[PDB]
Ligand binder design. Structure first.
Ligand SMILES: [Zn+2]
Ligand SMILES: [Zn+2]
Length: 64
């Protein structure tokens, strides 16, 4: 039968929040190159799983 699903998609919520403490960063937060919002204190990549590869060129073949 039908298992049932709530919603794998998020609502029309804003983007004012920290991706580390979830602290609403209003419209003055620190957005990372990856596309995450932080309260300035967690704007660093080391303080948040940042897949983005800042390091200069290195890899070669397709990965991840
Ligand atoms: Zn924060
Ligand atoms: Zn990041």
């Amino acid at each position: 039968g039908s298992s049932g699903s709530s919603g794998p998609s998020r609502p029309v919520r804003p983007n004012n929040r920290c991706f580390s403490c979830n602290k609403k960063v209003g419209v003055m937060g620190f957005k990372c190159k990856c596309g995450s919002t932080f309260c300035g204190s967690h704007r660093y990549p080391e303080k948040h799983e940042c897949s983005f590869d800042f390091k200069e060129v290195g890899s070669g073949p397709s990965s991840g």
